[PDB]
Design a protein around this ligand. Structure first.
Ligand SMILES: *C(=O)/C(=C/C)[C@@H]1NC(C(=O)O)=C2[C@@H](OC)CCC[C@@H]21
Length: 359
């Protein structure tokens, strides 16, 4: 098999050149292999302070936060609280606009509502304005025909999905996903006492961190360390090991195939491609020109339950952070790459593929 010594060389020889080429200050990596996570840390979390990256350093996950959103939703579905086939309106009777008529919770969850934009406008600062926004939105496409990557879409699915529980989103997440999985250093809002662990992001020489915004916890506001993230990946890769019945089901639902777009399949948060898949196919869908383009979908009805022979992944970025996670259930291997610099997505998947290919 692969030796620990060999794995360390593979990780160092892949990660060290990447950091130098992409000028990334710090990086924390976890490689899941043979039932155990292996940690590798590099560089700095804060240049000014000269603080090294450690397995406790907190990185902004950006869109990888959507995997937590998906699982939390799947768990609510498994509890009988929500259904993906339900009209959005069942959860928001105030959304009276007739354009929402045939739009389901599935569409919000999978960016398939019909043209919801990338971001919730900055002018949207509260509930009543959020209503104004969706109420005046005019869909470019009919529901279930076009996938357009949007925080305005999945962010609303997140808010609405926790409504029947009676709990605010943050408490629903902590109570039903984070605490049971022992993700004690995973935060939507980082306490004052945990702040010294929070790395600084770096853009083009400026120290940066994520700013607030409507539906941020649902779409891009989660921060964690590489330990919690490795254990999160391990729960999603092997949910047979998750004791909570509905949480086990929610994990499955988030890795289920709802739509096919080219060579990939849309889940709830997670995205998948059939394994074996070559690097060039994964890398080519990594591009922003592609990731952000509106594309037609082929519906999978009924949705297909998780398939073990899959490359499941998700990229995430904020102004100062660049993260990526990928695992193959069939092979029980996975990788987590957290970084305090948003470097090119294709570079992320290339390195992840190369090291996983070594296993
Ligand atoms: C998820 O990480 C995410 C939310 C939409 C990040 N948004 C942005 C952005 O700058 O608007 C990026 C881009 O990386 C350039 C494009 C894909 C999504 C991500």
């Amino acid at each position: 098999p692969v030796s620990e010594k060999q794995l360390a060389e593979v990780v160092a020889n892949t990660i060290t050149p990447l950091m130098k080429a992409q000028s990334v200050p710090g990086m924390a990596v976890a490689v899941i292999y043979q039932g155990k996570p292996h940690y590798y840390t590099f560089g700095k979390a804060d240049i000014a302070a000269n603080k090294p990256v450690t397995p406790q350093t907190l990185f902004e996950l950006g869109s990888i936060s959507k995997t937590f959103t998906g699982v939390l939703g799947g768990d609510a579905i498994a509890r009988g609280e929500i259904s993906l086939d339900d009209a959005v309106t069942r959860y928001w009777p105030q959304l009276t606009g007739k354009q929402w008529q045939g739009i389901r919770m599935l569409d919000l969850a999978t960016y398939t509502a019909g043209g919801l934009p990338l971001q919730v406008p900055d002018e949207v600062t509260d509930n009543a304005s959020l209503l104004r926004f969706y109420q005046n939105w005019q869909p470019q496409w009919k529901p279930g025909t076009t996938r357009l990557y949007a925080n305005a879409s999945i962010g609303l699915f997140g808010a609405l999905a926790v409504k029947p529980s009676g709990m605010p989103y943050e408490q629903a997440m902590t109570t039903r996903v984070l605490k049971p999985l022992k993700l004690d250093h995973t935060w939507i809002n980082v306490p004052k006492a945990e702040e010294a662990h929070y790395a600084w992001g770096y853009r083009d020489g400026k120290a940066v961190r994520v700013s607030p915004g409507m539906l941020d916890a649902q779409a891009y506001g989660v921060k964690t360390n590489v330990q919690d993230m490795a254990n999160w990946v391990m729960a999603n890769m092997a949910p047979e090991n998750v004791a909570d019945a509905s949480l086990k089901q929610g994990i499955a639902l988030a890795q289920s195939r709802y739509w096919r777009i080219g060579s990939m399949y849309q889940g709830l948060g997670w995205e998948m491609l059939n394994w074996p898949v070559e690097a060039n196919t994964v890398v080519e869908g990594s591009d922003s020109k592609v990731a952000l383009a509106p594309l037609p979908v082929a519906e999978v009805n009924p949705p297909a339950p998780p398939v073990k022979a899959s490359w499941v992944h998700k990229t995430g970025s904020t102004g100062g952070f660049g993260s990526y996670v990928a695992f193959i259930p069939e092979k029980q291997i996975g990788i987590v790459m957290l970084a305090n610099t948003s470097y090119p997505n294709p570079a992320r998947v290339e390195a992840a593929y190369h090291i996983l290919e070594a296993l």
